[PDB]
Amino acid sequence: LSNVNSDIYFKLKKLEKEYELLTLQEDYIKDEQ
Amino acid sequence: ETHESGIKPYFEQKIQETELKIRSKTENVRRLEAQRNAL
């Protein structure tokens, strides 16, 4: 289970870099409309 | 196996704050997509 705990944090830190770019999308189409 | 289960929801608590956010933005940025599509 020590391979499940080291992968969780990593995945969370990886996917949140790609969903921080979809939160920029919110600001941008709020001012565009 | 029981020592690795008590320090595992607190590795996961830091990542689950960003995760709840990301459930509500996703709905919210498709909410403003629909308004903007009709305009």
From Swiss-Prot, chain A:
Post-translational modification: N-acetylated by NAT3.
Subcellular location: Cytoplasm; Nucleus
Signal peptide: none
Family statement: Belongs to the AAA ATPase family.
Role: The 26S proteasome is involved in the ATP-dependent degradation of ubiquitinated proteins. The regulatory (or ATPase) complex confers ATP dependency and substrate specificity to the 26S complex.
Name of this protein: 26S proteasome regulatory subunit 6B homolog
Native organism: Saccharomyces cerevisiae (strain ATCC 204508 / S288c)
From Swiss-Prot, chain B:
PTM notes: N-acetylated by NAT1.
Signal peptide location: none
Membrane-spanning ranges: none
Coiled coil: none
Compartment(s): Cytoplasm; Nucleus
Protein family (similarity comment): Belongs to the AAA ATPase family.
Subunit structure: May form a homodimer or a heterodimer with a related family member. Interacts with OLA1, TMA17, and UBR1.
Role noted for this protein: The 26S proteasome is involved in the ATP-dependent degradation of ubiquitinated proteins. The regulatory (or ATPase) complex confers ATP dependency and substrate specificity to the 26S complex.
Miscellaneous notes: Present with 4700 molecules/cell in log phase SD medium.
Protein name: 26S proteasome regulatory subunit 8 homolog
Organism: Saccharomyces cerevisiae (strain ATCC 204508 / S288c) (Baker's yeast)
Gene name of this polypeptide: RPT6
